[PDB]
């Protein structure tokens, strides 16, 4: 709030205004402000940004000035004009060329999640997702609602690959996976995690398993290399590729316990002695009261998917019931953690 | 982000997730969580909250647990159950009975502003408001779009009165207004600021001026006391009530310079020597690069109204052109500041 107001009032305003700060970041990403600034020979003024993003003078200045206050951009003065430049933050996470780019996820959060979240009170009220109430699109089959169009499936796929450029190494190296020569990424999407897995484990080979529409899009928009293979199908009913390790990264959180149990059971019966299951999810503290970002993510699963985020013990009951033993989890200090369980005799 | 990740990545996530934190606060307000907790004989468990707000168990727990992490609620343990209670923050700003309640504004930000803000990129792109693109409602006359229904006009009116319970005293006491026995609050709405003005200045009398629909709603939903009068009309063309002081609180920011100049001109020609104009707005720093909340508010005017937030110098050019002299402003340390100018001979 105001600089002299009581701390509780300032906090309440921070929370109330949060949606505005999210949209400033999302719109700056959608307009390509950071890309234009990274492609420029040096820093740019309002009129040069407004012209490059094809937007209004007043609108651009408001946007750039808010970005400076938020520490997403730096400003400098030359003559009778402000000149904007990228920060370490925006160069690393907000430019398309950066390997650690978070662009596509931000644009996705802005275009889909933000819309869904307006219906939060009803998702809480009813205990169910709101794709029909938000997009008019039936969600009886979760992913036909999520991939409501070709361009929307490419965007989802581009969005999801982005976290692995920052979190990939932590999760794949939490446990020594060199022990599993043949791997399968169930619901592997574009294959970003698999690409990382193969550079990390030179001996290993991996199959990316996903629905026919994702596999086709992955091959059409992402190039590959000699360690990675693709199998298309439905993990709830099709035969799974033979593997020593099955990886489930952000798959279990999309579904309720019963659906999770079914998939875990199929994987278990497909595994051989010494076989493993690597579950990659954001772990909830045992009291379900943190971390805050994970709690928000669990609420985002209520609003969007059929699932929730879970505690280590919850993933343990699920994996133990499916038949797995030697349950171990590793808290990475990152958004995504790793769980590994094995099949015995 | 994750507790061990780089500070820039944690900051980017804070910003990206802001919309979720806003909606948690808005939905907790819409569900009446804080009221139910204040009306209870003591602290309540998940099942008692879920039943009282008529919502799902999973949804309620997620909501309450996020509120605890956000410091909006406190939790305690008794037997095999968590018990939630209000904080100083929620009791003072989030309960309907509290005089400093911010409820109605939060519900309004959630229901209208949040929706509008999804169209931020286009409001920036085009340099205009999005009522037609968001609500289907024509905005050619700003307030017919803002008061699109009776219940929506009552909500807007209830929302706007709330800031004056906290910021009212600062703005009205920045300058000694005892010098102006007769006052007029132009666009005074429900008359919250006028009610405060009259307790602060016992000698003074005030007329609340607003559009016929607002005046009728104000008399029908708010009771009055012997110092306050109501005149209905259009400040752009109707005769203004006779007054020594004209107050413009959050009126100028809704409009562009030309519309502001027109209204200021009418007020000037209505004033007599020694007459005053009290402008109450959130002042932008001279470089237009802060405060952050004011910059967000200026962007909210681009997205919603026909105006912007302005710098002291900008309000000075406007007031000076209309004919006013002795321009003075006072930065309160709060969201809203005060500007006073006078009419000479
Ligand atoms: C939330 S995405 C996670 C993708 C990826 N593992 C990551 O973390 O970036 C869940 C993935 O599961 C895939 N999926 C959903 N249902 C499936 C099914 N029945 N059979 C195969 N793949 C499925 C989706 O198409 C999607 O790529
Ligand atoms: C943004 S509200 C501010 C209300 C109040 N002064 C406050 O700060 O809480 C602007 C007020 O101006 C009123 N208004 C808009 N156009 C008007 C007009 N042409 N004549 C009279 N009142 C008008 C609106 O109905 C509304 O109550
Ligand atoms: Zn079995
Ligand atoms: Zn168990
Ligand atoms: Zn004149
Ligand atoms: Zn001037």
From Swiss-Prot, chains A, B:
Q: What induces it?
A: By all-trans-, 9-cis- and 13-cis-retinoic acid and by serum treatment, following starvation, in the retinoblastoma cell line Y79.
What does the annotation give as the result of altering residue 11 to F? Reduced enzyme activity
Keyword terms of this UniProt record: Lipid metabolism, Melatonin biosynthesis, Methyltransferase, S-adenosyl-L-methionine, Transferase
List the pathway annotation: Aromatic compound metabolism; melatonin biosynthesis; melatonin from serotonin: step 1/2
Q: Where does substrate bind?
A: 254, 300, 304
Q: Name one GO cellular component term.
A: cytosol
The protein in question is named Acetylserotonin O-methyltransferase
Its lineage opens with: Eukaryota, Metazoa, Chordata, Craniata, Vertebrata
